[PDB]
Design a protein around this ligand. Structure first.
Ligand code: AMP
Ligand code: AMP
Ligand code: CL
Ligand code: CL
Ligand code: CL
Lengths: 360, 360
């Protein structure tokens, strides 16, 4: 029986992808309403409630996680008791912006100019050895700053410590590469994906990344291989980069299945969810070859009219079962066509059904 | 919340196709082990246990079924309280071989020669207007008869009443057409698929039916549409035919998703399970266009080595969660590639993992 820290939609989808393989699941989440509960055994409890933690761990074959901000303490507490994939280290690295950048910077992968900022002297200490405008964000929320003074004003009423200074980067687009490494050591890579954000929320994902170079792919995969092996990664790893020209600058890493990959459920030969499961289980990884072209559109804080989205062919609706609320991810729609024209035509139909969707 | 009579694997896959649509499920089944119980709330009770039957229906939005032989009594007993799709009549027709052939004969669809037999005088009465060899099947098991006396030497120890005489048919192959009709009245048709049985159990399904002509397909659909409209059918209907030449004879019908359609989970734009749900929900039906080519091989009373099947590309494993037992359907594997050559290469490698399959 697989145990999953986090009862969100990512966990809900891991379970749905696992039942066909005859697997079992148990989730842990502090909210009785976790949508994964509608699909498997859900244990309600705080991650730092040792009692709930150990109760949930009983009989488990292994433990993995879907909630990216899960307390690393809860993951390490169970690490001794049962197998845990990905390794707790990955959470550590991914949960601290500075620790994240240094790690990749140390692997030899490009990253925006960044500098640690704990004191006003640090802010200046690197405010120029970085640039301007730029971003100042908590290492563990964030604020873009243009004015040389708006910066020293930024740290104020933001914390004043434990922050990171990143040099704003004018990117052509944002892309991400979902990669996977089995318990056996085998690896696999999905086509790059173009992600579009708006209001600080992923709104649309285009796969494969439109135009993506053939060398661009190998480039991303290369960086990904380095990261996974460096961490003894097992499962699915999501790497987000900024694309400037033909360069890739590491932006963020998530030790788990990622939103920018939901299109793999029908748009790839093997979903990221099934592969994550195959990986942590020590089974042969499945093919990541794409099935035509996909457009992943998130459903944020609103419930589109089902009959209307289902009228579009190639459109695959996914409602998470969560209660609708402002800015909340309540589902997504994957449009899988076999020609960019058709794809672009269906996307037109769906854009009229979803708000705040930045597409033309 | 959709309620399903029967907790078998068909119900289990129905629920899996539904969660992505934000649906809920409740199953009713005599066995506490119903594999559907692993994916939804399962009420353990006999279909003729009125107490359990009504307890099960509490609050359901509608009720459908997967148990091929659910007592039609239980289906009609709820038809009053809530919507029931497909209509109970389809269950009556499907459960009586004579009523089945009689029905389709009336629609004008070809059927092997058949004659009712409830006594020695009837056997002869039709045993001549049919011709040996032939099959003497019980209307509700069966026996192939060659000898003029092996016939009379069959009705006994087989009943003697409520049997039907069918004229043995030398078919090129067997094929089935899955059709769907929603409340709205809209309809859809999957590609005909080629089914190969052995030991009286479906062993392999090839989709789309190899070589099937555009005319054959159109005819099969014509019959299907007549049957569906004649029954005010709502949901997925599975029609099995015998292909002899360029014509096909109706052999059997099942008012539900069918085994010969499991390849549609990944081999068609919309699975038979999602379309069945879309139909009974009054939602726009989904495209039935095939995604390349598929081969559906059943897993009978044996658990293949998972690592071994996942080794082959394009292979999709589906373990039902049932306890392995002789003759029991415990899972299946859908292999879908985009070229007949590749398709045959895979089948070759899988055919070494599964016993009793008539391959090549
Ligand atoms: N260094 C950067 N330069 C420009 N935009 C950025 C930078 N870092 C983050 N963003 C934007 O902020 C959003 C991501 O927020 P976050 O996930 O906390 O990094 C995306 O919409 C990015 O376009
Ligand atoms: N009229 C028929 N002529 C030849 N074979 C038949 C006939 N009816 C049924 N069968 C065979 O019996 C099996 C179907 O069993 P059943 O579904 O109970 O009719 C299949 O493997 C068929 O090949
Ligand atoms: Cl949730
Ligand atoms: Cl079962
Ligand atoms: Cl499905």
């Amino acid at each position: 029986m697989i145990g999953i820290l986090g009862g969100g939609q990512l966990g809900r989808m891991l379970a749905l992808a696992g039942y066909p393989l005859g697997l079992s699941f148990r989730f842990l989440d502090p909210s009785p309403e976790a949508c994964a509960g509608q699909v498997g055994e859900l244990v309600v409890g705080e991650f730092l409630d040792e009692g709930a933690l150990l109760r949930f761990a009983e009989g488990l074959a292994l433990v993995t996680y879907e909630f990216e901000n899960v307390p690393v303490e809860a993951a390490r507490r169970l690490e001794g008791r049962l197998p845990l994939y990905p390794p707790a280290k990955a959470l550590e690295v991914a949960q601290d912006r500075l620790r994240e950048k240094t790690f990749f910077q140390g692997l030899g992968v490009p990253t925006p100019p960044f500098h640690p900022v704990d004191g006003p002297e640090d802010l200046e200490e690197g405010l120029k050895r970085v640039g301007l405008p730029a971003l100042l964000k908590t290492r563990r929320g964030q604020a873009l700053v243009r004015t040389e003074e708006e910066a020293l004003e930024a740290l104020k009423a933001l914390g004043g410590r434990g922050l990171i200074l990143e040099g704003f980067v004018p990117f052509d687009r944002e892309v991400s590469l979902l990669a996977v490494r089995g318990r056996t050591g085998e690896v696999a890579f999905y086509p790059l994906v173009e992600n579009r954000h708006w209001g600080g929320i992923l709104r649309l994902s285009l796969a494969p990344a439109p135009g993506a170079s053939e060398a661009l792919q190998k480039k991303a995969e290369a960086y990904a291989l380095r990261a996974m092996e460096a961490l003894d990664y097992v499962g699915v790893l999501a790497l987000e980069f900024f694309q400037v020209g033909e360069e890739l600058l590491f932006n963020e890493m998530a030790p788990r299945v990622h939103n920018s990959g939901h299109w793999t459920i029908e748009g790839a030969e093997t979903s990221q969810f099934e592969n994550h499961l195959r990986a942590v289980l020590g089974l042969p990884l499945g093919s990541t070859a794409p099935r035509g072209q996909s457009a992943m559109v998130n459903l944020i804080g609103e419930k589109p009219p089902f009959a209307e989205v289902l009228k579009v062919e190639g459109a695959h609706l996914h409602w998470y079962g969560k209660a609708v609320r402002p800015g909340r991810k309540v589902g997504h729609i994957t449009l899988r066509r076999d020609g960019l024209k058709a794809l672009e035509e269906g996307l037109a139909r769906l854009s009229r059904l979803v708000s705040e969707l930045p597409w033309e």
